[PDB]
């Protein structure tokens, strides 16, 4: 943390943050969500980290070079250490990236190494080659070298993500799935795990072995698992919570902007809220059905009437303000809602649905005040506009993500946030073989458009290809885009160091500080 000259620090440097739900895991290779990544950034540090404004900056690597954007060499700082005092070495990164790639680990982020094009990853994922054939090597204890199969100019931007953080081999090997318990875990970020009470709290304490420990200010941070946005706001206003999670309740938000304007932080955020359709299950394997659902949803009512938190109506998966996005707004988005409704009704009638044999399906969502109120609204809109009946089902976060990967569901509430600021952070998740593809969408035309992006060495051709890839996704109605999120959350006036400038919201508690109050 960089405390401005003249700010008076509180005697007690502790922080309580709400984190939306109970994490899936603390193992960097088993996680895929925001809550998970929030805790992961405080505990495990990769090659690079984001600075306080979100720019990729030195993490365990203090400096790096590339050769033709295909061979990347990372010089690791000599004083990087784990919490047990042992050095963090390039051997740790070699082991960790191989563990990520290995199919036996079954990471949801195994394809992150495909997104970066590390050599031999496709064969490794397919079990044709052992994980030790992965194109990574330790040239010495402080030098990690990565070899890609084609030039990737934005490669280094990927490296702040939890899936490419190191994990401690000796703890993993000795404790198996209990390696992350407080008595067993070993970490290399600014913090260490003190307590983990499922469905109550996660408490982290400063890691004195962290290389940049002298600049850490907060001594202890607690992450809570509250999925009710109303309750989070209530426990923030009671004094318990210093920073709410960044999901805001429909019940209270209008009042909050007028009651505590200065604490209501609203900033750009590279995330898209959408309804995920299970493309491999009838009747959702019919494009007419998917297009009808997409067109009949009225984004203006949802975004400006039922939610009104500053979100923008969406017509694509990749947010249009992602670095490198030059998207073409489809003609259906410019139409009136009545024109979209007739087309929707026309397509469903064409798909075989009638008043006596209507379309009836489930709308799965993770427990939340915000998601439940939006799903009830969407169910009413789809009933009014298209005559379809929806049965709402809530599931806790970890189970919800597992259900979507299991892929026998119908429609699910969804939302993807960028891992790096470039359109392929979204687009790669719709590849046929992506480990993150919970839409279960498989299009050879879409796959080809993305494969073509690194075969050109031109940003304009790349951007035109991303635009066409979005058009292909839209043409197939893989998903139902709803809105691009804003990052809205409450932050107490005494919490210093949170700029809101990072559109990825990669916060590190080592960057914050508590002002005297």
Q: Rounded distance, CA 299 to CA 397, Å?
A: 25
This entry's atomic model was obtained through X-ray
Q: Domains for the chain: give ranges and CATH numbers.
A: 1-44+169-270+487-517 (3.40.190.10), 45-168 (3.90.76.10), 271-486 (3.10.105.10)
For 392, phi and psi rounded to 5 degrees?
-80, 140
Structure tokens at 130: 């052992």
- From edge to edge, which strands make up the β-sheet containing 312-313? 312-313, 479-490, 264-277, 411-417, 360-366, 389-395
Q: Find out whether 397 and 36 touch, Cβ atoms under 8 Å.
A: no
**Closest of 413, 451, 452, 453 to residue 434, by C-alpha:** 451
Helix or strand holding residue 94 (H, E): helix 90-101
- C-alpha of 453 from chain center: 23
Return d(Cα 163, Cα 335) in angstroms, integer: 41
Q: What string of DSSP letters covers 339-407?
A: HHHHHHHHHHHHHT--SSS--EEEEEEES-HHHHHHHHHHHHHHHHHH--EEEEEEE-HHHHHHHHHHT
Q: Residue 84, exposed/middle/buried by CB under 10 A (0-12, 13-18, 19+)? A: middle
- Give the Cα separation of 442 and 434 in Å (integer): 10
Closest CA to 411 of 296, 261, 501: 296
For residue 327, the tally of other CB atoms under 10 A from its CB is 21
Q: Are 233 and 252 in contact (CB under 8 A)?
A: yes
Q: How far apart are CA 512 and CA 510, in angstroms?
A: 6
Phi and psi at residue 367, to the nearest 5°? -35, 120
Distance in angstroms (rounded) separating the CA atoms of residues 359 and 361: 7
Q: Are 109 and 100 in contact (CB under 8 A)?
A: yes
Annotate 38-80 with DSSP letters as a single string.
HHHHHH---SEEE-TTS-EEESSEEEEEEETTTEEEEEE-TT-
What are the φ/ψ torsions at residue 83 (nearest 5 degrees)? Answer: -70, -15
The pairs formed by 120-129 with CB atoms below 8 angstroms and a separation of 24 or more are 120/149, 125/101, 125/433, 125/435, 127/103
Torsion on CA atoms 93, 96, 98, 102, rounded to nearest 10: -170
Quickly count helices (H) and strands (E) in the chain. 16, 18
Beta-carbon contacts of residue 177 (< 8 Å; ≥ 6 apart): none
* Per-residue 3-state assignment (H helix, E strand, C coil) for 223-250: EECCCCHHHHHHHHHCCCCCECCCCCCC
Distances (CA, A) of 503 to 116, 267, 331: 21, 8, 28
Q: Write the CB contacts of 352 (distance below 8 Å, at least 6 apart in sequence).
A: none
Helix ranges (H only) for 387-458 are 397-406, 424-427, 444-452
Q: How far is CA 406 from CA 110, 277, 306, 331, 409, in A?
A: 16, 13, 31, 34, 8
The Cα angle at residue 172 between residues 59 and 45, in degrees rounded to 5: 10
Tell me which residue of 516, 515, 497, 517 sits closest to 507, measured CA to CA.
Answer: 497
Task: Look at residues 218, 246, 305 and name the one whose alpha carbon lies nearest to residue 495.
Answer: 218
How far lies 292's CA from each of 352, 371, 391, 516, in Å?
13, 22, 18, 55
Looking at residue 118, the DSSP 8-state letter turns out to be B
Phi, psi (degrees; rounded to nearest 5) at 71: -115, 120
The SS3 assignment for 331 reads helix
Where would I find the H helices in 109-259? Answer: 112-115, 121-125, 169-175, 229-237, 253-259
- Among residues 227, 97, 111, 157, the alpha carbon closest in space to that of 421 is found at 157
Q: Which helix (H) or strand (E) holds 417?
A: strand 411-417
Cβ atoms of 49 and 57 within 8 Å: the answer is yes
User: Residue 112, Cβ neighbours under 10 Å: how many?
Assistant: 28
Cis peptide upstream of residue 283 (ω within 30 degrees of 0): yes
**How far lies 186's CA from each of 20, 35, 366, 502, 511, in Å?**
25, 20, 31, 28, 21
3 state SS of 222: strand
Phi-psi region of 335 (alpha: psi -120 to 50; beta: other; left: phi over 0): beta
If we measure between CA atoms, which residue out of 358, 351, 393, 355 comes closest to residue 376?
A: 393
How would you classify the pairing of strands 360-366 and 389-395?
parallel
Angle at alpha carbon of residue 422, lines to 418 and 424, rounded to 5°: 80
Question: To one decimal place, what's the resolution in Å?
Answer: 1.8
Q: Would you put residue 315 in left (φ > 0), alpha (ψ -120 to 50) or beta?
A: alpha
Q: What DSSP designation does 305 have?
A: I
Q: Mark 251-269 as b/e (b = at least 16 C-beta within 10 Å).
A: ebbeebbeeeeebbbebbb
Token pair listed for 517 = 């109050």
- Closest to 114 measured CA to CA, from 424, 456, 514: 424
């Amino acid at each position: 943390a960089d405390v401005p000259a003249g700010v008076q620090l509180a005697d007690k440097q502790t922080l309580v943050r709400n984190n939306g739900s109970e994490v899936q895991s603390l193992d960097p290779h088993k996680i895929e969500g925001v809550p998970e990544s929030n805790v992961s950034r405080d505990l495990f540090e990769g090659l690079l980290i984001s600075d306080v404004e979100g720019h990729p900056s030195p993490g365990v690597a203090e400096k790096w070079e590339n050769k033709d954007f295909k061979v990347w060499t990372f010089h690791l700082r000599e004083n990087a250490k784990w919490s047990d005092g042992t050095p963090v070495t390039a051997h740790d990164f070699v082991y960790s990236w191989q563990r990520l790639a290995d199919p036996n680990t079954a990471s949801p982020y195994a394809s992150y190494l495909q997104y970066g094009h590390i050599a031999n990853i496709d064969d490794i994922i397919a079990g044709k080659k052992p994980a030790t054939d992965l194109g990574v090597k330790a040239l010495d204890d402080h030098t990690f070298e990565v070899t890609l199969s084609e030039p990737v100019p934005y490669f280094y931007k990927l490296l702040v993500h939890p899936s490419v953080s190191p994990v401690p081999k000796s703890a993993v090997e000795k404790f198996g799935d209990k390696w992350t318990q407080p008595a067993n875990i070993v970490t290399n970020g600014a913090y260490k795990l003190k307590n983990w009470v499922v469905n109550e709290r996660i408490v982290l304490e400063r890691n004195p072995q962290y290389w940049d420990n002298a600049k850490t200010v907060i001594n202890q941070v607690t992450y809570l698992p509250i999925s009710s946005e109303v309750t989070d706001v209530n426990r923030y206003r009671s004094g318990e919570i210093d920073m709410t999670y960044n999901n805001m309740p429909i019940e209270l938000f209008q009042k909050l902007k007028k009651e505590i304007p200065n604490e209501v932080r609203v900033d750009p955020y590279l995330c898209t809220y959408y309804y995920e359709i299970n493309n491999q299950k009838a009747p959702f394997n019919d494009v007419r059905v998917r297009t009808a659902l997409k067109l009949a949803l009225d984004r203006d009512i949802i975004v400006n009437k039922v939610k009104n938190q500053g979100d923008l109506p969406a017509y694509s998966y990749t947010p249009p303000y992602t670095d490198g996005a030059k998207l073409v707004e489809p003609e259906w988005f410019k139409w009136s809602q009545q024109k979209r409704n007739e087309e929707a009704k026309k397509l469903l009638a064409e798909a075989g649905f009638t008043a006596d044999k209507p379309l009836t399906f489930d709308l799965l969502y993770n427990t939340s005040d915000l998601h439940k109120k939006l799903a009830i609204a969407v169910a009413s809109i789809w009933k009014k506009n298209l005559g379809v009946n929806v049965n709402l089902e809530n599931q806790e976060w970890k189970t919800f993500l597992d259900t979507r990967h299991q892929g026998t569901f119908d429609v699910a509430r969804a939302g993807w946030c960028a891992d790096y600021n470039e359109p392929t952070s979204f687009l790669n998740t719709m590849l046929s073989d992506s480990s993150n593809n919970t839409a279960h969408y498989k299009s050879p035309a879409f796959d080809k458009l993305i494969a073509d992006t690194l075969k050109v060495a031109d940003d304009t051709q790349r951007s035109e290809l991303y635009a066409k890839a979005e058009q292909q996704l839209d043409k197939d109605s893989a998903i139902v885009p709803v809105y691009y999120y804003v990052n809205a959350r409450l932050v107490k006036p005494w919490v210093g160091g949170y700029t809101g400038k990072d559109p990825l919201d990669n916060i590190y508690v080592k960057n914050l500080y508590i002002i005297k109050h």
